[PDB]
Amino acid sequence: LHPVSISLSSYGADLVRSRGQASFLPLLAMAGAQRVELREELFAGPPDTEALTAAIQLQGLECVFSSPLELWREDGQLNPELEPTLRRAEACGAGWLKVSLGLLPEQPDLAALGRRLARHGLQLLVENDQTPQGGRIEVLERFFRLAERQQLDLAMTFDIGNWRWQEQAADEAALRLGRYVGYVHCKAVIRNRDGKLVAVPPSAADLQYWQRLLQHFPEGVARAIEYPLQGDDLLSLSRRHIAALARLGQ
């Protein structure tokens, strides 16, 4: 089996806020997950980070801290909230911080980025988002090429569904960006009756298609569920969805 993560936003923001994120960690371990993705927008709440760290450690889970933070500001400077967010993430027991790109300047100071990352013990993940600045193949390809040149402790999170918001083809993205991918965010996307894009659980067809996309990324890369998980028995549901994802490969 390949390593599987669950983004707790999958369970619904209201439910997660009400029950607290730490309460989902035993559920994830019991369902067979290897990693949890925490969500900054989902603490009620100023968290007991100590209690949260102890919970992750007890379950033997890896932990990704996901933030809506955009790395680069309109003005061309690294987001001053980067270090405060890294501290937050580390305090919660995360091994990775996941962010969006923001607006990549013509001249990014990746040396500066490195120095800030070096003050903390987290690998940085940068995810394609739904915006023009952070969600399009061309600028992301530029960022990852450069980042690799200066050898940053950073990797791409390839979000399968987000490309849809920028009318970018996931297959083309995978072909061009797949060598940089360290984490896959899985969701299916449909256009609803009013023409609006909405994230949904995968069909059997989507899953087979995702297996083909995964051929473009290093074998065994961690894959995350970030789509609705709703049902009366969340443990059994999560287990069945983890198994389906873990099984994707050659």
Note the residues at the interface with a second copy (CB under 8 A): 164, 167-169, 171-172, 175-176, 178-179, 188-195, 200-201, 203-206, 208-209, 211-212, 215-220, 249-250
Q: Can you say how many angstroms the Cα of residue 68 is from the centroid of all Cα atoms in its chain?
A: 10
* Distance of closest approach, residue 36 Cβ to a second copy, in angstroms: 23
Contact indicator for 127, 98 with CB cutoff of 8 Å = yes
| Orientation of helix 170-177 relative to helix 137-149, angle to 10° | 20
* Distance of closest approach, residue 159 Cβ to Na ion, in angstroms: 5
Toward a second copy, which CB reaches closer, 69 or 139?
139
Identify what 48 binds: Na ion, a second copy, none; CB under 5 to 8 Å per kind: none
Contact indicator for 131, 104 with CB cutoff of 8 Å = no
Toward a second copy, which CB reaches closer, 175 or 235?
175
* Distance of closest approach, residue 170 Cβ to a second copy, in angstroms: 9
Kindly tell me which residue out of 159, 174, 182, 213 binds Na ion, with binding defined by CB under 5 A. 159
List, in order, residues 6 or more apart from 93 with CB less than 8 Å away.
Answer: 49, 52, 53, 55, 56, 57, 63
Using CB under 5 A, count the residues that bind Na ion: 2
Contact indicator for 248, 2 with CB cutoff of 8 Å = yes
Toward Na ion, which CB reaches closer, 185 or 241?
185
Toward a second copy, which CB reaches closer, 115 or 212?
212
* Distance of closest approach, residue 111 Cβ to Na ion, in angstroms: 28
Count of Cβ atoms closer than 10 Å to residue 86 Cβ: 23
- Rounded CA-CA distance 11/6 in Å is 9
Identify what 50 binds: a second copy, Na ion, none; CB under 5 to 8 Å per kind: none
Of all residues in the shown chain, the one whose CB is closest to Na ion is: 159
Residue 22 phi, psi (nearest 5)? -65, -25
DSSP-based helix, strand, coil % in the chain, nearest 5? 45, 25, 35
* Structure tokens, 211: 């297996």
Identify what 159 binds: Na ion, a second copy, none; CB under 5 to 8 Å per kind: Na ion
* Distance of closest approach, residue 207 Cβ to a second copy, in angstroms: 9
Toward Na ion, which CB reaches closer, 10 or 53?
10
- Looking at residue 130, the DSSP 8-state letter turns out to be S
Residues of the shown chain interacting with Na ion in the complex, contacts defined by CB under 5 A: 159, 185
